[PDB]
Amino acid sequence: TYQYNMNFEKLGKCIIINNKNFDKVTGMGVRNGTDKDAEALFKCFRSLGFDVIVYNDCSCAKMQDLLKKASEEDHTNAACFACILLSHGEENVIYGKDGVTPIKDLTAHFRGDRCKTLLEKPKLFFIQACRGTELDDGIQ
Amino acid sequence: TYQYNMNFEKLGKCIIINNKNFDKVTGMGVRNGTDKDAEALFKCFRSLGFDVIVYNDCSCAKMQDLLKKASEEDHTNAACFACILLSHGEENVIYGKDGVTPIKDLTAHFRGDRCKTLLEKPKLFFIQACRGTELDDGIQ
Amino acid sequence: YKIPVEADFLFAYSTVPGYYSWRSPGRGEWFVQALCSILEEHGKDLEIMQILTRVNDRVARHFESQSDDPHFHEKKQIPCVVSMLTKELYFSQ
Amino acid sequence: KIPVEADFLFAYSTVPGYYSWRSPGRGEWFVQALCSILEEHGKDLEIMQILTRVNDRVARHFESQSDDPHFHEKKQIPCVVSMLTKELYFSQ
Protein backbone atom coordinates (compact mmCIF):
# COMPACT_ATOMS: atom_id res chain seq x y z
CA THR A 1 0.00 0.00 0.00
CA TYR A 2 2.89 2.26 0.92
CA GLN A 3 5.57 0.93 -1.41
CA TYR A 4 6.05 0.83 -5.07
CA ASN A 5 5.20 -2.54 -6.59
CA MET A 6 8.46 -4.26 -7.54
CA ASN A 7 6.86 -7.46 -8.79
CA PHE A 8 7.86 -7.10 -12.47
CA GLU A 9 10.00 -9.12 -14.76
CA LYS A 10 12.64 -6.36 -14.85
CA LEU A 11 13.76 -3.71 -12.37
CA GLY A 12 14.14 -1.56 -15.42
CA LYS A 13 16.51 0.25 -17.68
CA CYS A 14 19.30 2.48 -16.43
CA ILE A 15 20.86 4.87 -18.92
CA ILE A 16 24.23 6.30 -18.00
CA ILE A 17 25.50 9.32 -19.91
CA ASN A 18 29.22 9.62 -19.30
CA ASN A 19 30.43 12.90 -20.82
CA LYS A 20 34.21 13.17 -20.59
CA ASN A 21 35.47 15.11 -23.61
CA PHE A 22 34.00 18.36 -24.81
CA ASP A 23 34.29 20.36 -28.01
CA LYS A 24 36.70 23.32 -27.66
CA VAL A 25 33.71 25.48 -28.83
CA THR A 26 32.16 24.97 -25.38
CA GLY A 27 35.27 26.03 -23.42
CA MET A 28 34.98 23.03 -21.05
CA GLY A 29 37.88 20.82 -19.91
CA VAL A 30 38.18 17.04 -19.92
CA ARG A 31 36.47 15.43 -16.93
CA ASN A 32 39.17 13.09 -15.57
CA GLY A 33 38.04 10.23 -13.40
CA THR A 34 34.59 10.12 -14.93
CA ASP A 35 35.24 6.67 -16.59
CA LYS A 36 36.09 5.35 -13.16
CA ASP A 37 32.86 6.83 -11.86
CA ALA A 38 30.80 5.49 -14.68
CA GLU A 39 32.31 2.05 -14.15
CA ALA A 40 31.51 2.04 -10.45
CA LEU A 41 28.00 3.23 -11.05
CA PHE A 42 27.54 0.65 -13.78
CA LYS A 43 28.39 -2.10 -11.27
CA CYS A 44 26.17 -0.79 -8.48
CA PHE A 45 23.21 -0.29 -10.73
CA ARG A 46 23.70 -3.60 -12.46
CA SER A 47 23.95 -5.14 -9.05
CA LEU A 48 20.62 -3.64 -8.01
CA GLY A 49 19.10 -5.28 -11.11
CA PHE A 50 18.99 -2.48 -13.69
CA ASP A 51 19.66 -3.20 -17.32
CA VAL A 52 22.42 -0.71 -17.57
CA ILE A 53 23.75 0.87 -20.77
CA VAL A 54 26.51 3.47 -20.85
CA TYR A 55 26.80 6.18 -23.56
CA ASN A 56 29.97 8.25 -23.77
CA ASP A 57 30.58 11.79 -24.89
CA CYS A 58 27.04 12.44 -26.07
CA SER A 59 26.09 15.58 -27.99
CA CYS A 60 23.01 17.48 -26.89
CA ALA A 61 20.90 15.91 -29.70
CA LYS A 62 22.17 12.45 -28.73
CA MET A 63 21.17 12.92 -25.05
CA GLN A 64 17.70 14.13 -26.04
CA ASP A 65 17.33 11.31 -28.52
CA LEU A 66 18.39 8.62 -26.05
CA LEU A 67 15.87 9.67 -23.48
CA LYS A 68 13.11 10.25 -26.03
CA LYS A 69 13.66 6.78 -27.42
CA ALA A 70 13.83 5.20 -23.99
CA SER A 71 10.60 6.99 -23.19
CA GLU A 72 9.06 5.38 -26.21
CA GLU A 73 9.88 1.80 -25.30
CA ASP A 74 7.35 -0.51 -23.64
CA HIS A 75 8.09 -0.51 -19.90
CA THR A 76 5.08 -2.73 -19.08
CA ASN A 77 7.35 -5.36 -17.51
CA ALA A 78 9.64 -2.93 -15.74
CA ALA A 79 9.25 -1.64 -12.20
CA CYS A 80 11.01 1.68 -12.77
CA PHE A 81 13.44 3.73 -14.87
CA ALA A 82 16.72 5.39 -14.00
CA CYS A 83 19.01 7.83 -15.74
CA ILE A 84 22.42 8.94 -14.50
CA LEU A 85 24.09 11.98 -15.94
CA LEU A 86 27.77 12.62 -15.53
CA SER A 87 28.95 15.96 -17.07
CA HIS A 88 29.63 19.63 -16.66
CA GLY A 89 26.52 21.66 -15.80
CA GLU A 90 25.26 25.09 -14.79
CA GLU A 91 22.02 25.86 -13.15
CA ASN A 92 19.15 23.94 -14.84
CA VAL A 93 21.26 22.73 -17.71
CA ILE A 94 23.71 20.01 -18.51
CA TYR A 95 26.50 19.91 -21.07
CA GLY A 96 26.61 17.68 -24.03
CA LYS A 97 29.91 17.62 -25.85
CA ASP A 98 28.68 20.42 -28.11
CA GLY A 99 26.82 22.75 -25.66
CA VAL A 100 24.08 22.77 -23.03
CA THR A 101 20.64 21.32 -22.90
CA PRO A 102 17.95 21.87 -20.23
CA ILE A 103 17.61 19.13 -17.64
CA LYS A 104 13.84 19.54 -17.73
CA ASP A 105 13.77 18.79 -21.43
CA LEU A 106 15.47 15.42 -20.85
CA THR A 107 13.08 14.48 -18.10
CA ALA A 108 9.88 15.71 -19.76
CA HIS A 109 9.80 12.72 -22.10
CA PHE A 110 8.84 10.56 -19.11
CA ARG A 111 5.94 12.54 -17.91
CA GLY A 112 2.75 10.67 -17.19
CA ASP A 113 0.95 11.72 -20.37
CA ARG A 114 3.97 10.97 -22.54
CA CYS A 115 5.16 7.59 -21.29
CA LYS A 116 2.20 5.65 -20.17
CA THR A 117 3.96 2.42 -19.45
CA LEU A 118 5.90 4.11 -16.60
CA LEU A 119 2.76 5.71 -15.16
CA GLU A 120 2.80 5.29 -11.36
CA LYS A 121 6.30 3.94 -11.49
CA PRO A 122 9.39 5.74 -10.23
CA LYS A 123 11.48 7.71 -12.68
CA LEU A 124 14.89 8.41 -11.12
CA PHE A 125 17.50 10.90 -12.29
CA PHE A 126 20.92 11.03 -10.69
CA ILE A 127 22.74 14.13 -11.78
CA GLN A 128 26.43 14.70 -11.23
CA ALA A 129 27.24 18.19 -12.52
CA CYS A 130 28.18 21.71 -11.41
CA ARG A 131 25.02 23.86 -10.83
CA GLY A 132 26.68 27.24 -10.78
CA THR A 133 29.91 28.48 -9.27
CA GLU A 134 29.14 29.16 -5.52
CA LEU A 135 31.53 27.45 -3.07
CA ASP A 136 30.34 26.19 0.31
CA ASP A 137 32.92 27.47 2.85
CA GLY A 138 31.49 25.26 5.68
CA ILE A 139 31.29 26.16 9.40
CA GLN A 140 32.49 25.01 12.95
CA THR B 1 23.60 7.20 14.77
CA TYR B 2 21.39 7.45 11.63
CA GLN B 3 18.74 9.82 13.15
CA TYR B 4 18.80 13.35 14.25
CA ASN B 5 19.32 13.65 17.99
CA MET B 6 15.98 14.58 19.60
CA ASN B 7 17.21 14.60 23.19
CA PHE B 8 16.89 18.31 23.74
CA GLU B 9 14.91 20.28 26.30
CA LYS B 10 12.50 21.25 23.45
CA LEU B 11 11.45 20.15 19.96
CA GLY B 12 11.82 23.72 18.77
CA LYS B 13 10.08 26.73 17.46
CA CYS B 14 7.42 26.61 14.66
CA ILE B 15 6.68 29.92 12.99
CA ILE B 16 3.52 30.15 10.88
CA ILE B 17 2.98 33.00 8.50
CA ASN B 18 -0.68 33.21 7.60
CA ASN B 19 -1.12 35.75 4.82
CA LYS B 20 -4.78 36.19 3.97
CA ASN B 21 -5.30 39.79 2.92
CA PHE B 22 -3.25 41.69 0.36
CA ASP B 23 -2.90 45.30 -0.68
CA LYS B 24 -4.91 45.87 -3.81
CA VAL B 25 -1.81 47.25 -5.64
CA THR B 26 -0.33 43.75 -5.59
CA GLY B 27 -3.15 42.51 -7.79
CA MET B 28 -3.76 39.52 -5.39
CA GLY B 29 -7.10 38.50 -3.86
CA VAL B 30 -8.10 37.39 -0.39
CA ARG B 31 -7.02 33.80 0.36
CA ASN B 32 -10.21 32.20 1.64
CA GLY B 33 -9.73 29.11 3.73
CA THR B 34 -6.28 30.05 4.93
CA ASP B 35 -7.45 30.77 8.53
CA LYS B 36 -8.77 27.21 8.65
CA ASP B 37 -5.48 25.94 7.34
CA ALA B 38 -3.40 27.95 9.81
CA GLU B 39 -5.51 26.76 12.69
CA ALA B 40 -5.18 23.12 11.70
CA LEU B 41 -1.47 23.42 11.23
CA PHE B 42 -1.02 25.23 14.53
CA LYS B 43 -2.74 22.28 16.28
CA CYS B 44 -0.74 19.57 14.47
CA PHE B 45 2.53 21.26 15.17
CA ARG B 46 1.66 22.06 18.79
CA SER B 47 0.66 18.45 19.17
CA LEU B 48 4.07 17.36 17.86
CA GLY B 49 5.82 19.40 20.58
CA PHE B 50 6.71 22.61 18.76
CA ASP B 51 6.43 26.08 20.37
CA VAL B 52 4.09 27.51 17.73
CA ILE B 53 3.69 31.18 16.90
CA VAL B 54 1.23 32.44 14.24
CA TYR B 55 1.72 35.76 12.45
CA ASN B 56 -0.97 37.08 10.17
CA ASP B 57 -1.05 39.38 7.15
CA CYS B 58 2.68 40.12 7.14
CA SER B 59 4.39 42.69 4.96
CA CYS B 60 7.57 41.68 3.19
CA ALA B 61 9.72 43.59 5.65
CA LYS B 62 7.94 41.84 8.49
CA MET B 63 8.49 38.35 7.09
CA GLN B 64 12.20 39.06 6.58
CA ASP B 65 12.57 40.66 9.99
CA LEU B 66 10.86 38.02 12.04
CA LEU B 67 12.84 35.23 10.32
CA LYS B 68 16.07 37.12 10.74
CA LYS B 69 15.27 37.57 14.43
CA ALA B 70 14.24 33.98 14.83
CA SER B 71 17.55 33.05 13.29
CA GLU B 72 19.34 35.10 15.92
CA GLU B 73 17.76 33.45 18.94
CA ASP B 74 19.55 30.78 20.93
CA HIS B 75 18.38 27.35 19.68
CA THR B 76 20.95 25.43 21.73
CA ASN B 77 18.21 23.58 23.65
CA ALA B 78 16.01 22.96 20.63
CA ALA B 79 16.16 19.85 18.36
CA CYS B 80 14.97 21.58 15.20
CA PHE B 81 13.22 24.53 13.61
CA ALA B 82 10.12 24.72 11.46
CA CYS B 83 8.60 27.52 9.36
CA ILE B 84 5.30 27.28 7.54
CA LEU B 85 4.44 29.86 4.89
CA LEU B 86 0.90 30.33 3.69
CA SER B 87 0.48 32.91 0.98
CA HIS B 88 0.35 33.68 -2.69
CA GLY B 89 3.49 32.93 -4.60
CA GLU B 90 5.14 32.83 -8.02
CA GLU B 91 8.26 30.99 -8.92
CA ASN B 92 10.97 31.46 -6.31
CA VAL B 93 9.02 34.18 -4.49
CA ILE B 94 6.31 34.59 -1.90
CA TYR B 95 3.93 37.41 -1.30
CA GLY B 96 3.76 39.60 1.67
CA LYS B 97 0.75 41.86 1.85
CA ASP B 98 2.61 44.63 0.07
CA GLY B 99 4.60 42.65 -2.58
CA VAL B 100 6.97 39.80 -3.14
CA THR B 101 10.11 38.57 -1.51
CA PRO B 102 12.46 35.74 -2.59
CA ILE B 103 11.94 32.49 -0.70
CA LYS B 104 15.66 31.88 -0.61
CA ASP B 105 16.30 35.17 1.10
CA LEU B 106 13.92 34.16 3.93
CA THR B 107 15.55 30.77 4.41
CA ALA B 108 19.13 31.94 4.08
CA HIS B 109 19.04 33.46 7.62
CA PHE B 110 19.15 29.85 8.90
CA ARG B 111 22.23 28.77 7.06
CA GLY B 112 25.03 27.08 8.98
CA ASP B 113 27.31 30.13 9.04
CA ARG B 114 24.51 32.45 10.09
CA CYS B 115 22.63 30.51 12.74
CA LYS B 116 25.12 28.50 14.60
CA THR B 117 22.81 27.18 17.21
CA LEU B 118 20.88 25.26 14.56
CA LEU B 119 24.00 23.66 13.12
CA GLU B 120 23.45 19.98 12.47
CA LYS B 121 19.85 20.35 13.21
CA PRO B 122 16.93 20.09 10.73
CA LYS B 123 15.53 23.34 9.41
CA LEU B 124 12.14 22.62 7.95
CA PHE B 125 10.19 24.89 5.61
CA PHE B 126 6.65 24.03 4.56
CA ILE B 127 5.60 26.26 1.74
CA GLN B 128 2.07 26.63 0.55
CA ALA B 129 1.94 29.04 -2.39
CA CYS B 130 1.34 29.13 -6.11
CA ARG B 131 4.74 28.65 -7.96
CA GLY B 132 3.68 29.77 -11.38
CA THR B 133 0.77 29.47 -13.77
CA GLU B 134 0.88 25.86 -15.14
CA LEU B 135 -2.01 23.39 -14.56
CA ASP B 136 -1.50 19.66 -14.39
CA ASP B 137 -4.24 18.20 -16.63
CA GLY B 138 -3.66 14.60 -15.23
CA ILE B 139 -3.65 11.23 -17.11
CA GLN B 140 -5.27 7.66 -17.17
CA TYR C 1 35.13 18.76 11.13
CA LYS C 2 33.22 21.33 9.04
CA ILE C 3 29.53 21.25 8.02
CA PRO C 4 28.19 22.64 4.71
CA VAL C 5 26.26 25.86 5.24
CA GLU C 6 23.33 24.50 3.13
CA ALA C 7 23.04 21.24 4.90
CA ASP C 8 20.13 20.08 7.04
CA PHE C 9 17.41 22.02 5.23
CA LEU C 10 14.23 20.47 3.97
CA PHE C 11 11.68 22.30 1.83
CA ALA C 12 8.24 20.82 1.52
CA TYR C 13 6.43 22.71 -1.22
CA SER C 14 2.70 22.34 -1.93
CA THR C 15 3.38 22.10 -5.66
CA VAL C 16 6.28 21.69 -8.11
CA PRO C 17 8.04 24.72 -9.80
CA GLY C 18 6.04 26.55 -12.44
CA TYR C 19 2.73 25.06 -11.24
CA TYR C 20 -0.51 26.23 -9.66
CA SER C 21 -1.56 25.15 -6.14
CA TRP C 22 -5.21 24.30 -5.37
CA ARG C 23 -7.71 24.87 -2.58
CA SER C 24 -11.19 23.20 -2.44
CA PRO C 25 -14.13 25.73 -2.27
CA GLY C 26 -14.99 26.55 1.39
CA ARG C 27 -12.18 24.62 3.00
CA GLY C 28 -8.46 25.18 2.58
CA GLU C 29 -5.46 24.16 0.60
CA TRP C 30 -5.19 20.55 -0.58
CA PHE C 31 -1.59 20.17 0.55
CA VAL C 32 -2.41 21.49 3.99
CA GLN C 33 -5.42 19.16 4.42
CA ALA C 34 -3.28 16.21 3.56
CA LEU C 35 -0.31 17.25 5.66
CA CYS C 36 -2.48 17.77 8.70
CA SER C 37 -4.30 14.54 8.19
CA ILE C 38 -1.12 12.43 7.90
CA LEU C 39 0.57 14.28 10.84
CA GLU C 40 -2.43 13.70 13.01
CA GLU C 41 -2.34 9.98 12.25
CA HIS C 42 1.42 9.41 12.02
CA GLY C 43 3.44 12.49 12.96
CA LYS C 44 4.92 10.79 15.94
CA ASP C 45 5.67 7.41 14.35
CA LEU C 46 6.92 7.95 10.77
CA GLU C 47 10.09 9.57 9.45
CA ILE C 48 9.64 12.96 7.89
CA MET C 49 10.11 11.63 4.31
CA GLN C 50 7.59 8.85 4.87
CA ILE C 51 5.16 11.42 6.08
CA LEU C 52 5.76 13.73 3.12
CA THR C 53 5.71 10.89 0.65
CA ARG C 54 2.31 9.92 1.95
CA VAL C 55 1.30 13.51 1.61
CA ASN C 56 2.47 13.44 -2.00
CA ASP C 57 0.24 10.40 -2.68
CA ARG C 58 -2.80 11.88 -0.92
CA VAL C 59 -2.63 15.11 -2.84
CA ALA C 60 -2.04 13.19 -6.08
CA ARG C 61 -4.95 10.80 -5.60
CA HIS C 62 -7.56 12.12 -3.27
CA PHE C 63 -7.87 15.48 -5.07
CA GLU C 64 -9.14 16.73 -8.43
CA SER C 65 -10.45 20.27 -9.25
CA GLN C 66 -14.05 21.04 -10.37
CA SER C 67 -14.96 24.28 -12.25
CA ASP C 68 -17.46 25.80 -14.78
CA ASP C 69 -14.41 27.16 -16.73
CA PRO C 70 -13.03 24.29 -18.93
CA HIS C 71 -9.53 25.85 -18.64
CA PHE C 72 -9.55 25.13 -14.81
CA HIS C 73 -11.67 21.94 -14.81
CA GLU C 74 -10.42 18.53 -13.56
CA LYS C 75 -6.80 19.51 -12.77
CA LYS C 76 -4.30 17.79 -10.48
CA GLN C 77 -1.32 18.75 -8.36
CA ILE C 78 1.79 17.21 -6.96
CA PRO C 79 3.89 18.51 -4.13
CA CYS C 80 7.65 18.55 -4.16
CA VAL C 81 10.05 17.80 -1.31
CA VAL C 82 13.63 19.08 -1.50
CA SER C 83 15.88 17.42 1.05
CA MET C 84 19.34 18.41 2.17
CA LEU C 85 18.90 16.48 5.41
CA THR C 86 21.85 14.29 6.61
CA LYS C 87 19.87 12.05 8.96
CA GLU C 88 16.43 10.63 9.51
CA LEU C 89 13.98 12.81 11.38
CA TYR C 90 11.45 11.44 13.76
CA PHE C 91 9.52 13.86 15.95
CA SER C 92 9.83 11.84 19.02
CA GLN C 93 11.12 8.92 21.25
CA LYS D 1 -6.20 10.17 -12.69
CA ILE D 2 -2.47 10.78 -11.87
CA PRO D 3 -0.51 14.06 -12.08
CA VAL D 4 1.86 14.11 -15.04
CA GLU D 5 4.79 15.31 -12.78
CA ALA D 6 4.33 12.74 -10.08
CA ASP D 7 6.72 9.86 -9.35
CA PHE D 8 9.94 11.59 -10.34
CA LEU D 9 12.97 11.78 -8.11
CA PHE D 10 16.08 13.86 -8.83
CA ALA D 11 19.21 13.21 -6.86
CA TYR D 12 21.61 16.05 -7.56
CA SER D 13 25.25 15.93 -6.52
CA THR D 14 24.97 19.50 -5.20
CA VAL D 15 22.39 22.21 -4.42
CA PRO D 16 21.38 24.94 -6.98
CA GLY D 17 23.96 27.68 -7.59
CA TYR D 18 26.81 25.53 -6.20
CA TYR D 19 29.97 23.85 -7.48
CA SER D 20 30.33 20.00 -7.40
CA TRP D 21 33.68 18.43 -6.29
CA ARG D 22 35.94 15.57 -7.33
CA SER D 23 39.05 14.45 -5.35
CA PRO D 24 42.32 14.55 -7.45
CA GLY D 25 42.70 11.04 -9.00
CA ARG D 26 39.53 9.26 -7.65
CA GLY D 27 36.38 10.77 -9.17
CA GLU D 28 33.38 12.70 -7.93
CA TRP D 29 32.55 12.88 -4.22
CA PHE D 30 28.83 12.25 -4.72
CA VAL D 31 29.51 9.25 -6.89
CA GLN D 32 31.95 7.70 -4.43
CA ALA D 33 29.42 8.03 -1.67
CA LEU D 34 26.41 6.85 -3.72
CA CYS D 35 28.31 3.75 -4.83
CA SER D 36 29.60 3.06 -1.38
CA ILE D 37 26.11 3.23 0.22
CA LEU D 38 24.38 1.31 -2.59
CA GLU D 39 26.88 -1.42 -2.38
CA GLU D 40 26.34 -1.76 1.37
CA HIS D 41 22.59 -1.02 1.54
CA GLY D 42 21.02 -0.72 -1.93
CA LYS D 43 18.88 -3.76 -1.31
CA ASP D 44 17.81 -3.09 2.29
CA LEU D 45 17.10 0.63 2.66
CA GLU D 46 14.47 2.86 1.10
CA ILE D 47 15.64 5.25 -1.56
CA MET D 48 15.43 8.32 0.71
CA GLN D 49 17.31 6.57 3.51
CA ILE D 50 20.02 5.77 0.98
CA LEU D 51 20.20 9.27 -0.39
CA THR D 52 20.07 10.76 3.04
CA ARG D 53 23.09 8.67 4.00
CA VAL D 54 24.71 9.85 0.85
CA ASN D 55 24.03 13.42 1.94
CA ASP D 56 25.72 12.83 5.27
CA ARG D 57 28.74 11.05 3.74
CA VAL D 58 29.32 13.88 1.29
CA ALA D 59 28.80 16.50 4.00
CA ARG D 60 31.21 14.92 6.48
CA HIS D 61 33.69 12.64 4.84
CA PHE D 62 34.80 15.23 2.27
CA GLU D 63 36.64 18.55 2.25
CA SER D 64 38.67 20.12 -0.64
CA GLN D 65 42.48 20.85 -0.54
CA SER D 66 44.14 23.47 -2.87
CA ASP D 67 47.00 26.05 -3.10
CA ASP D 68 44.52 28.75 -4.14
CA PRO D 69 42.86 30.04 -0.91
CA HIS D 70 39.71 30.77 -2.97
CA PHE D 71 39.27 26.94 -3.54
CA HIS D 72 40.75 25.65 -0.26
CA GLU D 73 38.80 23.65 2.38
CA LYS D 74 35.34 23.81 0.71
CA LYS D 75 32.32 21.62 1.31
CA GLN D 76 29.37 20.32 -0.62
CA ILE D 77 25.89 19.07 0.06
CA PRO D 78 23.75 17.12 -2.41
CA CYS D 79 20.08 17.81 -2.94
CA VAL D 80 17.24 15.33 -3.35
CA VAL D 81 14.03 16.46 -5.03
CA SER D 82 11.20 13.94 -4.51
CA MET D 83 7.83 13.83 -6.19
CA LEU D 84 7.51 10.14 -5.24
CA THR D 85 4.16 8.83 -3.96
CA LYS D 86 5.38 5.67 -2.31
CA GLU D 87 8.43 4.20 -0.71
CA LEU D 88 11.00 2.63 -3.03
CA TYR D 89 12.94 -0.41 -2.23
CA PHE D 90 15.01 -2.13 -4.85
CA SER D 91 13.81 -5.62 -4.19
CA GLN D 92 11.10 -8.17 -3.45
Curated annotation (Swiss-Prot), chains A, B:
Changing R131K: Does not significantly affect thiol protease catalytic efficiency. The record marks R131 as: Involved in allosteric regulation. Changing C130A: Abolished thiol protease activity. Residues 131-140 are annotated as: Loop L2. The modification Phosphothreonine is found at T117. The active site is at H88, C130. Residues 20-31 are annotated as: Loop L1. This is Caspase-7 subunit p20. It comes from Homo sapiens. The chain holds residues 57 to 196 of 303 of the full protein.
Swiss-Prot record, chain C:
This is Caspase-7 subunit p11. Residues 64-78 are annotated as: Loop L4. Changing C80 to T/N: Does not significantly affect thiol protease catalytic activity. The modification (Microbial infection) ADP-riboxanated arginine is found at R23. Changing Y19W: Strongly reduced thiol protease catalytic efficiency. Signal peptide: none annotated. The modification Phosphoserine is found at E29. Changing C80S: Decreased phosphorylation by PAK2. Residues 16-28 are annotated as: Loop L3. The chain holds residues 211 to 303 of 303 of the full protein. It comes from Homo sapiens (Human). The record marks Y13 as: Involved in allosteric regulation.
From Swiss-Prot, chain D:
Residues 63-77 are annotated as: Loop L4. Changing Q65D: In esCasp-7 V4 mutant; promotes specificity toward alternate peptides with VEID, YVAD, WEHD, LETD or LEHD sequence. This is Caspase-7 subunit p11. It comes from the Eukaryota. The record marks Y12 as: Involved in allosteric regulation. Disulfide bonds: none annotated. The gene is CASP7. Changing Q65C: In esCasp-7 V3 mutant; promotes specificity toward alternate peptides with VEID, YVAD, WEHD, LETD or LEHD sequence. The modification (Microbial infection) ADP-riboxanated arginine is found at R22. Residues 15-27 are annotated as: Loop L3. It comes from Homo sapiens. The modification Phosphoserine is found at E28.
